[PDB]
């Protein structure tokens, strides 16, 4: 928890927030699982509904 | 001769070269990747070398905490999702997905049981990733501007013995550093020192003794000297001197002890050579001598003996009941006598900070050398070690065996003083060449090791029982490795695609730099040389002239890469006297023992009759007799490369000037209407046929129609029923090459001309009639014309620019983005406000330039409207806006514009809209026209397919009044059933083919309508392809074919050029001074041969104009050109191509000598002197000297004047220093360097230096001041503190320094 709490801040050079880091990690994990099971890379508009979040927020 | 020389018959000049046909030029990388990607069924997947081996070695893993194994069955290769022709435009990765089989089992259970409830494997499958499948021409398209991976030449794995050349020595002694270079691991150095001791300098970190290394292996102490010493036949105290010794090593040594015979005596005091004493001892039943003390007694010797050998006594206690002196010295200098101490020393050397442990140190050495996971020495390394130092079969084992280090130490101590030659570290065979295959294999192995580490870290958390298949295996580092290899790797840095020769020479380029080898600085003067073994395998002339000389030398034309990695050049094997036909690619390692005799030797009808044939037995050339010859060179051009093989009379060129010409053969832009050189080389046809951008006839049938954009060909003279049908070759139109040049193809085949399979149908960029044509042949006069060619500059006539003969396209294809910035989404609408209507011309409603509309330099190309915040409100600007009534535009002008140039017309404007909202209000007409043309070409292909299908069906039905019933193509309309059934089957197969084509086209249109692949930020990307028509303006680096480069001089009119005897004016007037200075006299011989060919062409075309296909014209062609007589009626077409000069295929080293060129000039109506009378053009006077006026093959090298010119008073400045940017990228400025500022410093021009580097560039507060002063009229300036000094003092102030101005 401390590494994930600190890696999410002092790793991007811009100090991305912890919740945004976890959201982008969830997005990349969903994209990886889709590439592994479904097939080709999904569109960014599809990842918004794949995680049950706003379509504009994922963009 | 195969529809490529019949119209361009080249009179060959080689004596009789037919030893071995040269392999495919791109075959190096092709065969490399074809052992990295099998791409076949299961029995074809058995490959110990390639991605399969590394995958099976890294994919299977185990879990020591849960007993979870991840087995590998096999991987299935799938077709690429995007085609090469479709991937070049999309600018995406031309890669195919990798599907590998997985098998997770939990059979190994607890309770002393070997089978669990889920013991059965699951047969999983995971999407590994997409790898860039090698194109048929070897391009490896990772994105737009396809980059081919150049082969690398790293140090081959294996033991090395680099005898020092006196450097780093005590006084003058040698070192003999025995170093074994592993394929993947840590290096080892067994070098010596002035103290005559072997030190194991592991990875050049420390210099610990080799006794520690031997203790780490276990064979050290009382058993290490077993192979170094032995027992002596000495005795104890007794009557006289009793000893059962045998004299076998006393020769050449003074008799320090009276070791006379027992009965009579021997071993006289002289002790000269002991030639008779040894024989007497051998014949006397042993050398029983009756006689030292201060010798070495470190032999095998715990009750009466002790450790160490230092007595200094006379054999007390009953003696414990100059070639080799290295092992005994190291055992004493070593302070560690226990294996634990050696392990601790090794751990301290490798990891000094970490505290060494008993088991930790032993585990470190094992993981470093005894572990195949880290010390992954390739099979080539093991075979090279077995060849250098003889050992048993060890092809399977990779890590250095404990017995291998002993043999290495023994061979090192033997080679310290003679006893075999050292292993040169600068040998071609010693330097194995790596290609894109092995490089990608190694980097994919690294990525697979990372993925295995990730899977081992992730499997401990997720249980293997009832787990989702391939849920723990990651795919990011798998594709990330190949992305980095094709994105920013030094080997994948660029692909020189200026012409078909540049692609071949770039694909056949062995670069010694990059990851895994010496960098550009690391090379030094050693590796920048050419070794004798380089002969035949790597060209010594074609090499870059810059700092990377000797490091990026291209592979030879005949050289091939063996499975191990060494370059294998062909050699025509010859028996005693009679040279047989059996050929074998002898590697450089095995070439030393074999004696080689060069080609171009006068061989008789059955054998060689010279008896003094030249050659080299091992590197050094000598004069070997007719006998004792087993290897012979295949062809004389085997030493030269592809780019160098096209140099006519290359044997006449200088060794250095040929490097300049061989480098510019690959640096010649593709010219429109470019024809083959009249004095070219036979290699040109092979390099053009075995290169890219040239369509080769994959079938035997006759061509049906030709419309430039495509070429349809019949199936064959004997085609299968439904194997492939007809094969249409979509001719590549003018697309931007990787060098921003044109790539155009012309259908050389005519309508209704049968073409066999394997020949070039349509020429590529800079090719005519199939033969490679880097440029156009222009009439040259090697005379100084009014000083316009005083230096190496090349004078030019207006005829070579008026006739459009040296003009290329050079499609720039600028790119624009529409990324949604934070201050509102960026727009690509018609135009930004505050812009004149003159610049908005040639723009459609979308905002891009109309396809085919000429755009001047600086005109609006794509209107980019980028919303932003309110700019800084200035008072004067606000007053002006209020006066004019307009409102301040909230958007900033960011529309893309053409840089300063002569680009003009626009070829193609591709728009890549985002997948979300594409074609909503922009680029609608573009996509509409795209789909219309796509449907049109699909309909044309369907129509031609139906036409050939109906033709084949009619041909099949006529044999089994059909004109009155044309609709019976699908029905027999009779009682026949077998023929009707066969016709129905063929028609259904052809309908399936048509349906597959329609499915591909509908997939393409659906991908286009759904939105092309765009970056995550930009939503609409416009790739406008602007094409130029650059003429021969003064400044173009028009270099010759041999190396006589030079900027084009002032373009003289076609009236002022020097007149010839026939009235023709030479197109170029070179300088004759370049020949004596740089010995490239072959350029003069090449020009004489070109003049002879041009006169022959003028004689034949003047003979055909009076009588077409005359009976006497064939006689003259036979006299000049035998494969000439052809039964076809192409003689009327062959003369049309020969009228510009009968081409010649002269070999690189077996071409025409002086006598051959002389006879050609005599038979071609040319003056026997080679030169010709040349009347002046400026004033007009018969020159009082024979002037050389020939047809030299000039080029149009990419170093033009347009792409190199630059002028920027004030452009965009940098950020770190606030200086003007460099290069011609964005209005750069010529950097005024320390060595170029010293020119003004030594000069009295200090005001310039007080304004060139003070107020000109690095004064943000002084640059604007000086510009305003210059614009006002006064040439006054002021600059106290430049921005350079400001940033320097700020950086110095960043540290503990106190840099601060004063007074």
Short mmCIF file of N, CA, C and O in Angstrom, two decimals, chain B residues 401-503:
data_model
loop_
_atom_site.label_atom_id
_atom_site.label_comp_id
_atom_site.label_asym_id
_atom_site.label_seq_id
_atom_site.Cartn_x
_atom_site.Cartn_y
_atom_site.Cartn_z
N UNK B 401 32.13 -25.31 -19.11
CA UNK B 401 32.36 -26.45 -18.24
C UNK B 401 33.62 -26.24 -17.40
O UNK B 401 34.51 -25.45 -17.75
N UNK B 402 33.69 -26.96 -16.28
CA UNK B 402 34.86 -26.87 -15.42
C UNK B 402 36.12 -27.34 -16.13
O UNK B 402 37.22 -26.83 -15.86
N UNK B 403 36.00 -28.31 -17.04
CA UNK B 403 37.14 -28.77 -17.82
C UNK B 403 37.53 -27.79 -18.91
O UNK B 403 38.67 -27.83 -19.39
N UNK B 404 36.61 -26.91 -19.33
CA UNK B 404 36.93 -25.94 -20.37
C UNK B 404 37.88 -24.87 -19.85
O UNK B 404 38.77 -24.42 -20.59
N UNK B 405 37.72 -24.46 -18.59
CA UNK B 405 38.62 -23.45 -18.03
C UNK B 405 40.03 -24.00 -17.90
O UNK B 405 41.01 -23.29 -18.11
N UNK B 406 40.16 -25.29 -17.55
CA UNK B 406 41.48 -25.90 -17.47
C UNK B 406 42.15 -25.93 -18.83
O UNK B 406 43.34 -25.60 -18.95
N UNK B 407 41.41 -26.31 -19.87
CA UNK B 407 41.98 -26.32 -21.22
C UNK B 407 42.33 -24.92 -21.68
O UNK B 407 43.34 -24.71 -22.37
N UNK B 408 41.53 -23.92 -21.29
CA UNK B 408 41.82 -22.54 -21.66
C UNK B 408 43.11 -22.08 -20.99
O UNK B 408 43.97 -21.46 -21.63
N UNK B 409 43.27 -22.38 -19.70
CA UNK B 409 44.49 -22.01 -19.00
C UNK B 409 45.70 -22.72 -19.60
O UNK B 409 46.78 -22.12 -19.74
N UNK B 410 45.54 -23.99 -19.97
CA UNK B 410 46.66 -24.74 -20.54
C UNK B 410 47.06 -24.17 -21.90
O UNK B 410 48.25 -23.97 -22.17
N UNK B 411 46.08 -23.88 -22.76
CA UNK B 411 46.40 -23.32 -24.06
C UNK B 411 46.98 -21.92 -23.92
O UNK B 411 47.85 -21.52 -24.70
N UNK B 412 46.54 -21.16 -22.91
CA UNK B 412 47.11 -19.84 -22.69
C UNK B 412 48.57 -19.92 -22.25
O UNK B 412 49.43 -19.21 -22.79
N UNK B 413 48.86 -20.78 -21.28
CA UNK B 413 50.24 -20.94 -20.83
C UNK B 413 51.11 -21.55 -21.91
O UNK B 413 52.34 -21.37 -21.89
N UNK B 414 50.52 -22.28 -22.85
CA UNK B 414 51.28 -22.79 -23.98
C UNK B 414 51.57 -21.73 -25.02
O UNK B 414 52.69 -21.65 -25.53
N UNK B 415 50.58 -20.89 -25.33
CA UNK B 415 50.74 -19.83 -26.31
C UNK B 415 51.52 -18.64 -25.76
O UNK B 415 51.88 -17.75 -26.54
N UNK B 416 51.75 -18.58 -24.45
CA UNK B 416 52.59 -17.52 -23.89
C UNK B 416 53.97 -17.52 -24.52
O UNK B 416 54.56 -16.45 -24.74
N UNK B 417 54.52 -18.70 -24.81
CA UNK B 417 55.83 -18.84 -25.45
C UNK B 417 55.69 -19.80 -26.64
O UNK B 417 55.94 -21.00 -26.52
N UNK B 418 55.30 -19.25 -27.79
CA UNK B 418 55.09 -20.08 -28.96
C UNK B 418 53.96 -21.07 -28.74
O UNK B 418 52.97 -20.78 -28.06
N UNK B 419 54.11 -22.26 -29.32
CA UNK B 419 53.16 -23.35 -29.13
C UNK B 419 51.77 -22.98 -29.64
O UNK B 419 50.77 -23.10 -28.94
N UNK B 420 51.72 -22.51 -30.88
CA UNK B 420 50.47 -22.14 -31.49
C UNK B 420 50.27 -20.63 -31.53
O UNK B 420 50.72 -19.90 -30.64
N UNK B 421 49.60 -20.16 -32.57
CA UNK B 421 49.36 -18.74 -32.74
C UNK B 421 48.17 -18.29 -31.90
O UNK B 421 47.29 -19.08 -31.57
N UNK B 422 48.17 -17.00 -31.56
CA UNK B 422 47.10 -16.41 -30.77
C UNK B 422 45.84 -16.31 -31.62
O UNK B 422 45.89 -16.45 -32.85
N UNK B 423 44.70 -16.05 -30.98
CA UNK B 423 43.43 -15.87 -31.66
C UNK B 423 43.19 -14.38 -31.86
O UNK B 423 42.91 -13.66 -30.89
N UNK B 424 43.32 -13.92 -33.10
CA UNK B 424 43.15 -12.50 -33.39
C UNK B 424 41.72 -12.06 -33.11
O UNK B 424 40.76 -12.68 -33.59
N UNK B 425 41.58 -10.98 -32.33
CA UNK B 425 40.26 -10.46 -31.98
C UNK B 425 39.65 -9.62 -33.10
O UNK B 425 38.52 -9.15 -32.95
N UNK B 426 40.36 -9.44 -34.21
CA UNK B 426 39.89 -8.64 -35.33
C UNK B 426 39.79 -9.47 -36.60
O UNK B 426 40.18 -9.03 -37.69
N UNK B 427 39.27 -10.69 -36.48
CA UNK B 427 39.12 -11.60 -37.60
C UNK B 427 37.64 -11.69 -37.97
O UNK B 427 36.78 -11.73 -37.09
N UNK B 428 37.37 -11.71 -39.27
CA UNK B 428 36.00 -11.82 -39.76
C UNK B 428 35.32 -13.08 -39.22
O UNK B 428 34.23 -13.02 -38.64
N UNK B 429 35.96 -14.24 -39.41
CA UNK B 429 35.46 -15.45 -38.80
C UNK B 429 35.41 -15.38 -37.29
O UNK B 429 34.56 -16.01 -36.65
N UNK B 430 36.32 -14.61 -36.69
CA UNK B 430 36.27 -14.39 -35.25
C UNK B 430 35.13 -13.45 -34.86
O UNK B 430 34.65 -13.50 -33.72
N UNK B 431 34.70 -12.60 -35.78
CA UNK B 431 33.61 -11.65 -35.55
C UNK B 431 32.37 -12.16 -36.27
O UNK B 431 32.13 -11.82 -37.43
N UNK B 432 31.59 -12.99 -35.58
CA UNK B 432 30.36 -13.50 -36.16
C UNK B 432 29.37 -12.36 -36.39
O UNK B 432 29.25 -11.45 -35.56
N UNK B 433 28.68 -12.40 -37.52
CA UNK B 433 27.74 -11.35 -37.89
C UNK B 433 26.34 -11.74 -37.42
O UNK B 433 25.88 -12.87 -37.64
N UNK B 434 25.68 -10.82 -36.73
CA UNK B 434 24.31 -11.00 -36.28
C UNK B 434 23.37 -10.20 -37.17
O UNK B 434 23.71 -9.10 -37.61
N UNK B 435 22.19 -10.75 -37.41
CA UNK B 435 21.20 -10.13 -38.29
C UNK B 435 19.97 -9.75 -37.48
O UNK B 435 19.96 -9.85 -36.24
N UNK B 436 18.92 -9.31 -38.18
CA UNK B 436 17.68 -8.95 -37.50
C UNK B 436 17.08 -10.15 -36.80
O UNK B 436 16.45 -10.02 -35.74
N UNK B 437 17.25 -11.35 -37.36
CA UNK B 437 16.77 -12.56 -36.75
C UNK B 437 17.33 -12.81 -35.36
O UNK B 437 16.58 -12.91 -34.39
N UNK B 438 18.66 -12.89 -35.26
CA UNK B 438 19.29 -13.17 -33.97
C UNK B 438 19.08 -12.02 -32.99
O UNK B 438 18.91 -12.25 -31.79
N UNK B 439 19.10 -10.78 -33.48
CA UNK B 439 18.89 -9.64 -32.60
C UNK B 439 17.49 -9.66 -32.00
O UNK B 439 17.31 -9.49 -30.79
N UNK B 440 16.47 -9.86 -32.85
CA UNK B 440 15.11 -9.96 -32.35
C UNK B 440 14.94 -11.17 -31.46
O UNK B 440 14.17 -11.12 -30.49
N UNK B 441 15.64 -12.27 -31.75
CA UNK B 441 15.57 -13.44 -30.88
C UNK B 441 16.11 -13.13 -29.49
O UNK B 441 15.49 -13.49 -28.49
N UNK B 442 17.25 -12.44 -29.42
CA UNK B 442 17.82 -12.09 -28.13
C UNK B 442 16.93 -11.12 -27.36
O UNK B 442 16.71 -11.29 -26.15
N UNK B 443 16.40 -10.11 -28.04
CA UNK B 443 15.56 -9.14 -27.33
C UNK B 443 14.22 -9.75 -26.92
O UNK B 443 13.69 -9.43 -25.86
N UNK B 444 13.67 -10.66 -27.74
CA UNK B 444 12.46 -11.37 -27.34
C UNK B 444 12.74 -12.34 -26.21
O UNK B 444 11.87 -12.57 -25.37
N UNK B 445 13.95 -12.89 -26.14
CA UNK B 445 14.32 -13.71 -25.00
C UNK B 445 14.41 -12.87 -23.73
O UNK B 445 14.00 -13.32 -22.65
N UNK B 446 14.92 -11.65 -23.84
CA UNK B 446 14.94 -10.74 -22.69
C UNK B 446 13.52 -10.41 -22.25
O UNK B 446 13.19 -10.43 -21.06
N UNK B 447 12.65 -10.10 -23.22
CA UNK B 447 11.26 -9.82 -22.89
C UNK B 447 10.56 -11.01 -22.28
O UNK B 447 9.74 -10.86 -21.37
N UNK B 448 10.88 -12.21 -22.76
CA UNK B 448 10.29 -13.42 -22.20
C UNK B 448 10.81 -13.71 -20.80
O UNK B 448 10.07 -14.23 -19.96
N UNK B 449 12.07 -13.37 -20.53
CA UNK B 449 12.58 -13.50 -19.17
C UNK B 449 11.87 -12.52 -18.23
O UNK B 449 11.54 -12.88 -17.09
N UNK B 450 11.63 -11.30 -18.70
CA UNK B 450 10.87 -10.34 -17.89
C UNK B 450 9.45 -10.84 -17.66
O UNK B 450 8.93 -10.74 -16.54
N UNK B 451 8.81 -11.39 -18.69
CA UNK B 451 7.46 -11.92 -18.54
C UNK B 451 7.45 -13.12 -17.61
O UNK B 451 6.49 -13.32 -16.85
N UNK B 452 8.50 -13.94 -17.64
CA UNK B 452 8.59 -15.08 -16.73
C UNK B 452 8.75 -14.62 -15.29
O UNK B 452 8.16 -15.21 -14.38
N UNK B 453 9.56 -13.58 -15.07
CA UNK B 453 9.67 -13.02 -13.73
C UNK B 453 8.33 -12.48 -13.25
O UNK B 453 7.93 -12.70 -12.10
N UNK B 454 7.61 -11.78 -14.13
CA UNK B 454 6.29 -11.26 -13.76
C UNK B 454 5.32 -12.39 -13.45
O UNK B 454 4.54 -12.31 -12.50
N UNK B 455 5.35 -13.46 -14.25
CA UNK B 455 4.45 -14.59 -14.02
C UNK B 455 4.80 -15.32 -12.74
O UNK B 455 3.91 -15.82 -12.04
N UNK B 456 6.09 -15.41 -12.41
CA UNK B 456 6.48 -16.03 -11.15
C UNK B 456 6.06 -15.18 -9.96
O UNK B 456 5.69 -15.71 -8.91
N UNK B 457 6.11 -13.85 -10.11
CA UNK B 457 5.67 -12.98 -9.03
C UNK B 457 4.15 -12.97 -8.89
O UNK B 457 3.64 -12.75 -7.79
N UNK B 458 3.43 -13.20 -9.98
CA UNK B 458 1.97 -13.14 -9.95
C UNK B 458 1.31 -14.48 -9.62
O UNK B 458 0.20 -14.50 -9.09
N UNK B 459 1.98 -15.60 -9.93
CA UNK B 459 1.38 -16.91 -9.71
C UNK B 459 1.32 -17.27 -8.23
O UNK B 459 0.49 -18.11 -7.85
N UNK B 460 2.18 -16.68 -7.40
CA UNK B 460 2.14 -16.97 -5.97
C UNK B 460 0.87 -16.47 -5.31
O UNK B 460 0.47 -17.01 -4.27
N UNK B 461 0.22 -15.45 -5.88
CA UNK B 461 -1.01 -14.91 -5.33
C UNK B 461 -2.25 -15.62 -5.86
O UNK B 461 -3.13 -15.99 -5.09
N UNK B 462 -2.32 -15.82 -7.17
CA UNK B 462 -3.46 -16.48 -7.80
C UNK B 462 -3.22 -17.98 -7.81
O UNK B 462 -2.18 -18.45 -8.30
N UNK B 463 -4.18 -18.73 -7.28
CA UNK B 463 -4.05 -20.18 -7.24
C UNK B 463 -4.20 -20.78 -8.63
O UNK B 463 -4.88 -20.24 -9.50
N UNK B 464 -3.55 -21.93 -8.83
CA UNK B 464 -3.60 -22.61 -10.12
C UNK B 464 -4.82 -23.52 -10.26
O UNK B 464 -5.18 -23.88 -11.39
N UNK B 465 -5.46 -23.90 -9.16
CA UNK B 465 -6.65 -24.74 -9.21
C UNK B 465 -7.87 -23.87 -9.47
O UNK B 465 -8.15 -22.93 -8.71
N UNK B 466 -8.60 -24.18 -10.54
CA UNK B 466 -9.79 -23.42 -10.94
C UNK B 466 -9.43 -21.96 -11.21
O UNK B 466 -10.03 -21.03 -10.66
N UNK B 467 -8.44 -21.76 -12.08
CA UNK B 467 -7.96 -20.43 -12.45
C UNK B 467 -8.28 -20.20 -13.92
O UNK B 467 -8.22 -21.12 -14.73
N UNK B 468 -8.63 -18.96 -14.25
CA UNK B 468 -8.92 -18.60 -15.63
C UNK B 468 -7.66 -18.79 -16.48
O UNK B 468 -6.57 -18.38 -16.05
N UNK B 469 -7.76 -19.41 -17.65
CA UNK B 469 -6.56 -19.66 -18.46
C UNK B 469 -5.89 -18.37 -18.89
O UNK B 469 -6.54 -17.35 -19.13
N UNK B 470 -4.55 -18.43 -18.98
CA UNK B 470 -3.66 -17.32 -19.33
C UNK B 470 -4.04 -16.00 -18.65
O UNK B 470 -3.89 -14.93 -19.24
N UNK B 471 -4.48 -16.08 -17.40
CA UNK B 471 -4.88 -14.89 -16.65
C UNK B 471 -3.71 -14.20 -15.96
O UNK B 471 -3.82 -13.01 -15.64
N UNK B 472 -2.61 -14.91 -15.72
CA UNK B 472 -1.46 -14.33 -15.05
C UNK B 472 -0.34 -13.93 -16.00
O UNK B 472 0.54 -13.15 -15.61
N UNK B 473 -0.34 -14.45 -17.23
CA UNK B 473 0.70 -14.12 -18.20
C UNK B 473 0.43 -12.73 -18.76
O UNK B 473 -0.68 -12.43 -19.21
N UNK B 474 1.45 -11.88 -18.73
CA UNK B 474 1.33 -10.53 -19.24
C UNK B 474 1.76 -10.46 -20.70
O UNK B 474 2.43 -11.35 -21.22
N UNK B 475 1.35 -9.38 -21.36
CA UNK B 475 1.70 -9.15 -22.76
C UNK B 475 2.37 -7.80 -23.01
O UNK B 475 2.79 -7.55 -24.15
N UNK B 476 2.48 -6.94 -22.00
CA UNK B 476 3.11 -5.63 -22.22
C UNK B 476 4.60 -5.77 -22.52
O UNK B 476 5.05 -5.29 -23.58
N UNK B 477 5.42 -6.40 -21.67
CA UNK B 477 6.85 -6.51 -21.98
C UNK B 477 7.15 -7.36 -23.20
O UNK B 477 8.24 -7.24 -23.77
N UNK B 478 6.22 -8.23 -23.61
CA UNK B 478 6.44 -9.02 -24.82
C UNK B 478 6.49 -8.13 -26.05
O UNK B 478 7.47 -8.14 -26.81
N UNK B 479 5.43 -7.34 -26.28
CA UNK B 479 5.40 -6.42 -27.41
C UNK B 479 6.24 -5.17 -27.17
O UNK B 479 6.66 -4.53 -28.14
N UNK B 480 6.48 -4.81 -25.91
CA UNK B 480 7.30 -3.63 -25.63
C UNK B 480 8.73 -3.83 -26.10
O UNK B 480 9.36 -2.88 -26.58
N UNK B 481 9.26 -5.05 -25.97
CA UNK B 481 10.62 -5.32 -26.42
C UNK B 481 10.75 -5.12 -27.92
O UNK B 481 11.68 -4.44 -28.39
N UNK B 482 9.82 -5.68 -28.70
CA UNK B 482 9.89 -5.53 -30.15
C UNK B 482 9.60 -4.09 -30.55
O UNK B 482 10.16 -3.59 -31.54
N UNK B 483 8.74 -3.39 -29.81
CA UNK B 483 8.48 -1.99 -30.10
C UNK B 483 9.74 -1.15 -29.91
O UNK B 483 10.06 -0.30 -30.75
N UNK B 484 10.46 -1.37 -28.81
CA UNK B 484 11.72 -0.67 -28.60
C UNK B 484 12.76 -1.07 -29.64
O UNK B 484 13.57 -0.24 -30.06
N UNK B 485 12.75 -2.34 -30.07
CA UNK B 485 13.69 -2.78 -31.09
C UNK B 485 13.42 -2.12 -32.43
O UNK B 485 14.35 -1.85 -33.19
N UNK B 486 12.15 -1.85 -32.74
CA UNK B 486 11.79 -1.20 -33.99
C UNK B 486 11.49 0.29 -33.83
O UNK B 486 11.25 0.97 -34.83
N UNK B 487 11.48 0.80 -32.60
CA UNK B 487 11.17 2.20 -32.37
C UNK B 487 12.38 3.09 -32.22
O UNK B 487 12.46 4.14 -32.87
N UNK B 488 13.34 2.70 -31.37
CA UNK B 488 14.49 3.54 -31.11
C UNK B 488 15.80 2.75 -31.03
O UNK B 488 16.77 3.25 -30.45
N UNK B 489 15.85 1.55 -31.59
CA UNK B 489 17.07 0.76 -31.56
C UNK B 489 18.09 1.31 -32.55
O UNK B 489 17.74 1.85 -33.60
N UNK B 490 19.37 1.16 -32.20
CA UNK B 490 20.43 1.63 -33.08
C UNK B 490 20.49 0.84 -34.37
O UNK B 490 20.91 1.36 -35.41
N UNK B 491 20.07 -0.43 -34.34
CA UNK B 491 20.06 -1.25 -35.55
C UNK B 491 18.87 -0.94 -36.44
O UNK B 491 18.97 -1.05 -37.67
N UNK B 492 17.74 -0.56 -35.85
CA UNK B 492 16.54 -0.18 -36.59
C UNK B 492 16.39 1.34 -36.70
O UNK B 492 15.27 1.86 -36.69
N UNK B 493 17.51 2.06 -36.82
CA UNK B 493 17.47 3.51 -36.77
C UNK B 493 16.94 4.13 -38.05
O UNK B 493 16.38 5.23 -38.01
N UNK B 494 17.08 3.45 -39.19
CA UNK B 494 16.72 4.06 -40.46
C UNK B 494 16.86 3.02 -41.56
O UNK B 494 17.57 2.02 -41.40
N UNK B 495 16.17 3.26 -42.67
CA UNK B 495 16.26 2.43 -43.86
C UNK B 495 16.50 3.32 -45.07
O UNK B 495 15.61 4.09 -45.47
N UNK B 496 17.70 3.23 -45.64
CA UNK B 496 18.06 4.04 -46.80
C UNK B 496 17.38 3.46 -48.03
O UNK B 496 17.85 2.48 -48.62
N UNK B 497 16.25 4.06 -48.42
CA UNK B 497 15.44 3.57 -49.53
C UNK B 497 15.39 4.58 -50.66
O UNK B 497 14.35 4.82 -51.28
N UNK B 498 16.54 5.20 -50.96
CA UNK B 498 16.59 6.17 -52.06
C UNK B 498 16.44 5.48 -53.41
O UNK B 498 16.00 6.12 -54.37
N UNK B 499 16.79 4.21 -53.50
CA UNK B 499 16.75 3.48 -54.76
C UNK B 499 16.86 1.99 -54.44
O UNK B 499 17.12 1.61 -53.29
N UNK B 500 16.65 1.12 -55.44
CA UNK B 500 16.73 -0.32 -55.17
C UNK B 500 18.10 -0.78 -54.70
O UNK B 500 18.20 -1.77 -53.97
N UNK B 501 19.17 -0.09 -55.10
CA UNK B 501 20.50 -0.46 -54.62
C UNK B 501 20.69 -0.04 -53.17
O UNK B 501 21.36 -0.74 -52.40
N UNK B 502 20.12 1.10 -52.78
CA UNK B 502 20.25 1.55 -51.40
C UNK B 502 19.54 0.61 -50.44
O UNK B 502 20.03 0.36 -49.33
N UNK B 503 18.39 0.07 -50.85
CA UNK B 503 17.70 -0.91 -50.01
C UNK B 503 18.53 -2.18 -49.86
O UNK B 503 18.65 -2.73 -48.76
#
